[PDB]
Amino acid sequence: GSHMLEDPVEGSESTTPFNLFIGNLNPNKSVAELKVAISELFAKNDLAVVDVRTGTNRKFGYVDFESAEDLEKALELTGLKVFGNEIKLEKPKGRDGTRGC
């Protein structure tokens, strides 16, 4: 069901290199279902969704990718429609993370 089972250790508080924020989620259904719709659409698109968290009761969720190729296809993935709602993306804080300033 939902047993992350993570070890007691801080690791950049991140699970993947490519991460961002998304919005436009069908508020008439569940945000968890909207995630699977994006994980299934990316599974048939040949993407690689590594993480997908929900945002607010059900207005927007975040998602992490597994490469620059999953992030570049994620950009062209604006043609989505989770539960009939083209999920939108966004650049949250922490844009960098591969090197540092």
Curated annotation (Swiss-Prot):
Residues of the full protein shown: 300 to 385 of 714
Modified residues (Phosphoserine): S12, S67
Modified positions (N6-acetyllysine) in chain numbering: K29, K59, K88
Organism (species): Mesocricetus auratus (Golden hamster)
Cross-link Glycyl lysine isopeptide (Lys-Gly) (interchain with G-Cter in SUMO1): where in chain: K35
Domain RRM: from-to ranges: 18-94
Subunit composition and interactions: Identified in a IGF2BP1-dependent mRNP granule complex containing untranslated mRNAs. Component of the SWAP complex that consists of NPM1, NCL/nucleolin, PARP1 and SWAP70. Component of a complex which is at least composed of HTATSF1/Tat-SF1, the P-TEFb complex components CDK9 and CCNT1, RNA polymerase II, SUPT5H, and NCL/nucleolin. Interacts with AICDA. Interacts with APTX. Interacts with C1QBP. Interacts with ERBB4. Interacts (via C-terminus) with FMR1 isoform 6 (via N-terminus). Interacts with GZF1; this interaction is important for nucleolar localization of GZF1. Interacts with NSUN2.
Purpose of the protein: Nucleolin is the major nucleolar protein of growing eukaryotic cells. It is found associated with intranucleolar chromatin and pre-ribosomal particles. It induces chromatin decondensation by binding to histone H1. It is thought to play a role in pre-rRNA transcription and ribosome assembly. May play a role in the process of transcriptional elongation. Binds RNA oligonucleotides with 5'-UUAGGG-3' repeats more tightly than the telomeric single-stranded DNA 5'-TTAGGG-3' repeats.
Gene this chain is encoded by: NCL
Post-translational note: Some glutamate residues are glycylated by TTLL8. This modification occurs exclusively on glutamate residues and results in a glycine chain on the gamma-carboxyl group. Symmetrically methylated by PRMT5.
Record PTM Phosphothreonine, positions in chain: T78
UniProt-annotated location(s): Nucleus, Nucleolus; Cytoplasm
Crosslink feature (Glycyl lysine isopeptide (Lys-Gly) (interchain with G-Cter in SUMO2)) location: K35, K81, K88
Name this polypeptide is given: Nucleolin
